[PDB]
Design a protein around this ligand. Sequence first.
Ligand SMILES: Nc1ncnc2c1ncn2[C@@H]1O[C@H](COP(=O)(O)OP(=O)(O)OP(=O)(O)O)[C@@H](O)[C@H]1O
Ligand SMILES: Nc1ncnc2c1ncn2[C@@H]1O[C@H](COP(=O)(O)OP(=O)(O)OP(=O)(O)O)[C@@H](O)[C@H]1O
Ligand SMILES: Nc1ncnc2c1ncn2[C@@H]1O[C@H](COP(=O)(O)OP(=O)(O)OP(=O)(O)O)[C@@H](O)[C@H]1O
Ligand SMILES: Nc1ncnc2c1ncn2[C@@H]1O[C@H](COP(=O)(O)OP(=O)(O)OP(=O)(O)O)[C@@H](O)[C@H]1O
Ligand SMILES: Nc1ncnc2c1ncn2[C@@H]1O[C@H](COP(=O)(O)OP(=O)(O)OP(=O)(O)O)[C@@H](O)[C@H]1O
Lengths: 362, 362, 362, 362, 362
Amino acid sequence: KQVSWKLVTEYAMETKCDDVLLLLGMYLEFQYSFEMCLKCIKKEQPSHYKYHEKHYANAAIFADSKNQKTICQQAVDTVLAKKRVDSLQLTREQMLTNRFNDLLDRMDIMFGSTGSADIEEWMAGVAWLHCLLPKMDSVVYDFLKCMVYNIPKKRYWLFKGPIDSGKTTLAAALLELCGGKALNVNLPLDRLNFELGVAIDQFLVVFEDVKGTGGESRDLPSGQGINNLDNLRDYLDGSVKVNLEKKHLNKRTQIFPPGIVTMNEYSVPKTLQARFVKQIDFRPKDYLKHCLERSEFLLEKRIIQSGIALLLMLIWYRPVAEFAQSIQSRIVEWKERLDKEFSLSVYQKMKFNVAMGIGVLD
Amino acid sequence: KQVSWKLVTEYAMETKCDDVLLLLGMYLEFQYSFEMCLKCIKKEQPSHYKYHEKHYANAAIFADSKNQKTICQQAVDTVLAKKRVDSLQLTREQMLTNRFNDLLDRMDIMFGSTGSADIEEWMAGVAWLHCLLPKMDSVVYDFLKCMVYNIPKKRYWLFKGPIDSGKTTLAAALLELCGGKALNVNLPLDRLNFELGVAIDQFLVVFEDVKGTGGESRDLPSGQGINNLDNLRDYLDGSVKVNLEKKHLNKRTQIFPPGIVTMNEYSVPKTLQARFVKQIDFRPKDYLKHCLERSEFLLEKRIIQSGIALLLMLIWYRPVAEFAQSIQSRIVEWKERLDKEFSLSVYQKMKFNVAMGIGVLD
Amino acid sequence: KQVSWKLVTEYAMETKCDDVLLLLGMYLEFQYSFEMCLKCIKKEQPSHYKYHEKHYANAAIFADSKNQKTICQQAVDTVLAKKRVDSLQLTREQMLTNRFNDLLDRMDIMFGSTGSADIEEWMAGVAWLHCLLPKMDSVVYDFLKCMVYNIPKKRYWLFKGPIDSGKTTLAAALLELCGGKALNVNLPLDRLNFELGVAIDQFLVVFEDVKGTGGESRDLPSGQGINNLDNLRDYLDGSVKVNLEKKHLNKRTQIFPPGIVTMNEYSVPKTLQARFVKQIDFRPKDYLKHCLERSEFLLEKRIIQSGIALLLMLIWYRPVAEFAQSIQSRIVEWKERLDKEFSLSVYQKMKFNVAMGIGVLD
Amino acid sequence: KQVSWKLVTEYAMETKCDDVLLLLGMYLEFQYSFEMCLKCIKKEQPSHYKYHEKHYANAAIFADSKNQKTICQQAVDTVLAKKRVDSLQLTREQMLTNRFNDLLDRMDIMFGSTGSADIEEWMAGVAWLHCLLPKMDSVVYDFLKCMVYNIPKKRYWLFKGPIDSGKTTLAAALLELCGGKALNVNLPLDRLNFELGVAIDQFLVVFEDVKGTGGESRDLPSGQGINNLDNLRDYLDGSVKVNLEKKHLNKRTQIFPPGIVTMNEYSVPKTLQARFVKQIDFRPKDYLKHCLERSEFLLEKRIIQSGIALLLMLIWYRPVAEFAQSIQSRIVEWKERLDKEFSLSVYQKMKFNVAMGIGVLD
Amino acid sequence: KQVSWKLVTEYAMETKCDDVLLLLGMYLEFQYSFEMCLKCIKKEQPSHYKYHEKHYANAAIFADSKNQKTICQQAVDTVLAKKRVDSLQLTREQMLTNRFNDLLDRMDIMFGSTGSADIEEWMAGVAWLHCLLPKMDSVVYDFLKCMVYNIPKKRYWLFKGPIDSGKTTLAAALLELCGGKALNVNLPLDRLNFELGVAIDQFLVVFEDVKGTGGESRDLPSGQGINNLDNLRDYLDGSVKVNLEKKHLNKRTQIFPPGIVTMNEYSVPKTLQARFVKQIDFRPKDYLKHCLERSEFLLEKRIIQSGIALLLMLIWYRPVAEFAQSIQSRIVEWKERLDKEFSLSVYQKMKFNVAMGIGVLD
DNA sequence: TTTTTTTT
Ligand SMILES: Nc1ncnc2c1ncn2[C@@H]1O[C@H](COP(=O)(O)OP(=O)(O)OP(=O)(O)O)[C@@H](O)[C@H]1O
Ligand SMILES: Nc1ncnc2c1ncn2[C@@H]1O[C@H](COP(=O)(O)OP(=O)(O)OP(=O)(O)O)[C@@H](O)[C@H]1O
Ligand SMILES: Nc1ncnc2c1ncn2[C@@H]1O[C@H](COP(=O)(O)OP(=O)(O)OP(=O)(O)O)[C@@H](O)[C@H]1O
Ligand SMILES: Nc1ncnc2c1ncn2[C@@H]1O[C@H](COP(=O)(O)OP(=O)(O)OP(=O)(O)O)[C@@H](O)[C@H]1O
Ligand SMILES: Nc1ncnc2c1ncn2[C@@H]1O[C@H](COP(=O)(O)OP(=O)(O)OP(=O)(O)O)[C@@H](O)[C@H]1O
């Protein structure tokens, strides 16, 4: 009896899988008895346990096929085709709206009954992040709209401050929230072409840790990056399309994505200073160090790195109207959860503790 | 029954699509019952909502096919094949006439009942552009004549001026108008081999901000561009066919397109200067800057970059006799719509406002 | 019923096509009723309207087929096979005789009843070329013999002088006449290898403006050209076979064709000097400059650089016995047409006009 | 009603054709009625007229097939396979015995009833050749045996010095005689590692004007040639197998053929120089130029570069005992014809003219 | 009826053929009747005449097949798989035991029914091999222990001493008995890092003459050798797995095999010598060069290079118990064939002919 | 499988 290629493709769509080998392996597992499946019973992975029951029948026939890799190819093509349709047609607002739906799906599992994540510890993260910069929550909302509107010239933000001052931590959480990529531009100029190649179809980019020239008088090690950026004006201003390259692959032409730049106190040419919308100073604050020293579970679980943490901050601080209308229904349910889960006083006690440099919890 | 490969080919032809994945993803959207299609109801994409109902039945059968990518590859071949047939058999004038028809179709949508753009905002951009150079519309017609005739060794125009004097802005508009590609010649002198490969079958090309060398009193970063261009005199001259290459492709051969070179005020080896028909000196101007600062919607919607803006200028300024005969019919209708919309006094008000450096609209 | 692959192959033989996409594109056009076919009614392209009625019945079936690119590939390889058989078995004289029939056929169209070209404008071109050098028509007869005899280490002519001397123009016309290829050697020493692969099965080749070294003493930037050719002596000599790459293909092995090298004046190693059988120096002549400046349809139609103009020059000047015996009938016909179409006095006055730098015509 | 792939393969064997396009082109000629075949009637090519009638019926059925290239690919592979099997099984003396039978069969045609050339002219060539250096036939007989006995690190003779010494002239004739290959050392060593792959299954090889270093006293431009000679010294010595590259097929390892190499009088180290046997740089004899100047049909017909000239010279001079036994029949058969044509006084008269700078005949 | 794919696969295992072209070619020969197969009748090639009669029926049907190359590809895969299994499963001991069995089978063939070799020739070869230093049969055998044992550190000896000493000739000869390869060492380690990877998967390895840094100052031309291996702490030592590259490949890495190094009488820093268990000076000693000046067959038929000569030096001097335990049966029988034909005294005449430079054969 | 890349 015949295999349904359709049922495979539906699984690939719903897992959003795009690796042929990864798709193949997981479908083959469904061939074993669903009714006894140990992986189902232990509820180990949703991509398995949500689906084994449905696909078991087809997986048995799949296991006898001789066309196995061919079936998977057509399935994975369908997922890649969907992405390319989306990329060429969605509004940037709708792109973001999808991305939040994915994070909210993950949170539903994480804080579920089988979920590992301690909603209390993750809210300790938000308390710490909200201390990192004044008006933190508004700053995020401003950055977000800036990426969505993507207005020419008004496109790029500068993070400035000493080593161990948090700028990478915040950048990483934003990049997770938005699904960009990091880039390094300190290379010899000829090398840049495949670096910039990374940007293709990305929503954000982060230029990490740009080195200037001079300031080794202040022990800042010198390098190319500042001068390279001054030479890339059209990519920053983002008014016109540019050509981007990948290894073995034809060039593609597109608007260069908006993004973030991070540095120590190198001297910045006035040319570059005109490019940035906002400069944010990061400074080491001694009380945060002593707090982290007493609340290491933040680092151990990588809480303060995560876009998941920033999304919780937005849900706590921003009005429901500020989110894209379609997801507001989920937002209200999460607001309701958090309102039930914490009094404002217990949350505010954490902020006070962080200001004491004391461990977050008491 | 069975898939009609013919219907898929027709869809590819009508959408003028030449990505196999985009075609695949697009066609798959039609598999759902037409009568409920929210994309149709929301009138989001004409390349969807025109076609769903017609293609529906075959899209459902296609969804079951075991052969899907083969069908799409054949369809994309016919679209690519038509481009090559046209490249060899059309006159350069006919090409331009076709390109204009496409832009005019986009203009029918933009300013159509879907109401999706403001014809007044777009007309403001023409005022700002008609300021950017003396006799601006005459310069466009001369450039168009130059590009249609394609006189050998009289094929290239040189743009120079300081930074911030609009030259890439003007190049971008001409490039969207004609169709073509930009190129970067400041590369290492080997990968030029693949860089120049982008010129294949194009109509224009633009070489962007070619770096000269030395004279650093000019405060100009040095690079390969000028000396490297002087090693490519042949490609400018366009007197004989040349050989062109892409990744994994064996060489095409054809005449290298006509086009534009842009640079800062470096000094030119006159052997290359001998290959430029005409040279245009851009100046920074204050009232442009002040007007533009008070007219930001121009930039926020990329109006002054966009080929539609130049086409609107020609329609306003030029006699109907100057257009190729078949589109004179559409040109007349657009002229009527413009004169209906705008008095000459309104246009003169706008131009005076640009000259006054106030926000254009008053 | 089924597609005839044989009929497709026959059309490819008839058209002497080579791009599988060009073949595919053009054959698809026949699917519409030739009865109505607008292109036929315009009589626009002979490659179409001579064949549409014949191929229509089979094109309708081809339009449905699932194999289309496969059918086309077989036909293209049939044409390529024919070329290889010809290349291995014709005398060089017969090859040229075939090539001349192709030009004569086009000329029968050029000045046919459809008569898109004016024979008087085209004859004006011949006068300008005959003026360009001493004994021009004798020089052309010499060059043809040299290329046909293909005597080893007596195979290459060097053109040199200043810029705008016309050397490229003359090369371009000779190249068109014999149907060679043009090659660049001012290039990366590695990728020369795929570059030279173009010359497989070609009758003739031309190297363009081969850059010398130490040239900038004379205002000429130095380059790879001479530095490359001094290696390739065996390719010039044509005394022994050499082996030729193509991308994704194993090497051919054959004698490298005879040809021409152009340069602006540079120092030549005496080793390389020994391998050019003839030297020609070209000089600017301001009366020619003024004449083209008036008679600019010469440039716009590219008349002065067509091999058709050289063929016409030979027809006017050379005895019929100098032509290969087969074509002598068509030669007598065209001689008679031309002697009828122009007096000697007309041609004499054209020369005086050109000599006097006035526009050619009065 | 079906193609005999066997009959196709027999033609490929009997022609010893080993190019798939060449065979394809060849066989398709047979589809027309051999009855009318102008090539047959003309006795145009033996590869045609011997075979047309035999293969006609099969060729008509082949002309309709849809597998045409696949059929030819299998046929070509049997030819390459046969070469490989002979290549390892046969004695080096046995190889030459086959090669000579090939050339003799050609001479049968050249001087046949078709008689397209005449032994008169060719013997004048022999006179010019045997004149060129002392005792020429003997030193050829030596070089032959050297290549049969193939002593390791003793496999190579060299010629050096003046341009137009004739060293290429001598080399080319030897290569046409043996059926070796020629290769170029002067490319980047990496490219050589692929290029040397052509040496597969060759009795003999040569390399021409390999660019050494120094010799600037003689204005010789230095290069990578000797660098890569100094590299490949195992290939030179043939004391061991080494690997040989191909595209789309495995590289194969075997011992390397013997040969000749030639250069201008560059430097090259004695870690080479000592190896070689019986090297002769030889230098001009001007009166030969003057005979040549008067006997130019030699060069036009490439006679003094044809290996057929050498074979005629050996037939003329050498005892019948000097040759392998089977061919001694045909040796005598030809040696009769030389006597039957020529008195000694003919050859004597020729060598007077040659010695005395007049054209060979009087 | 149909081709047995199985029978074709047997012949590949039988002949150990592993080239698809050779397999195809030889198998096609069997299509004629073995019954009067003249190759069989002449007994020329066992790889033919041993098999023809069995395979004939299958070969006839094979010659009629249309899939022929596909059949052969599978058969060659079989032999390749068979090899790759053994390469992973077996000990160096077992591997070397098989290798002796093969070379002893070549010994059997050489001195076989044909008498194609006369062992006295190889006694003279062995007598020459004996000359170099005392008991060197044992010292070879003891090195071969070091090779099989591959005990860490205890892996490497150094062949010091000048040109033509045979030291590379002998090191190469072991590659017949054992496989392996030699490599250069005289760039800075910088480049040699791209060259070390040819040591991968080698049974054993060899290294060419270590130059001293600036060694021209020591009258031995320069190259950066010693300071490279002064500092490659581990590579010759070989406890744990090393890291390596073949230029433009990847770091598949494992143990660095044991091997030989040589030098042309250069100097040695301590950490270079620490790489070896031994260092020995090799010279082209006076009577030895004189005996080669007087003894020729030992070079002419490559005896001095062949592994067969090394095997016989061991059979002539190593006692049976030292050999591969089952092969010792054959070792006795060859020892018998030695003693059957030579006393040690007649062999001592040869030793003394070498020892006093007079020609060996006597 | 090459090609492109990588090296350069
Ligand atoms: N504002 C801060 N005050 C004190 N300590 C900080 C602060 N921000 C970060 N930290 C400490 O610095 C460590 C590294 O943080 P982070 O990577 O964000 O710093 P950074 O300045 O962006 O570094 P880099 O420039 O190296 O990428 C954190 O794990 C934490 O221990
Ligand atoms: N003539 C002008 N005078 C003043 N400001 C100008 C002028 N033209 C452009 N601008 C401003 O400069 C910005 C950049 O324009 P554009 O990028 O085309 O110029 P450019 O710097 O000269 O270009 P290029 O990249 O070719 O060197 C515009 O978006 C506008 O804000
Ligand atoms: N002898 C001449 N006298 C004056 N003008 C000339 C002459 N020959 C050519 N021209 C002008 O020079 C233009 C370029 O000619 P052409 O490209 O053949 O010259 P070239 O010497 O080969 O140049 P380059 O070195 O730039 O390739 C022609 O189109 C014509 O306008
Ligand atoms: N003995 C000779 N005297 C004069 N000219 C000679 C003599 N031998 C050969 N030549 C000339 O040398 C020309 C080229 O021959 P060939 O290519 O064999 O020489 P070559 O020394 O190998 O040259 P190169 O080093 O330039 O390749 C011949 O066409 C002939 O005219
Ligand atoms: N002891 C010897 N004396 C003289 N000649 C010898 C001796 N041994 C071998 N030969 C001959 O010299 C040739 C070269 O020997 P080989 O290359 O092995 O010496 P080498 O000392 O390793 O030299 P190099 O240091 O130059 O590589 C041998 O193949 C053989 O023909």
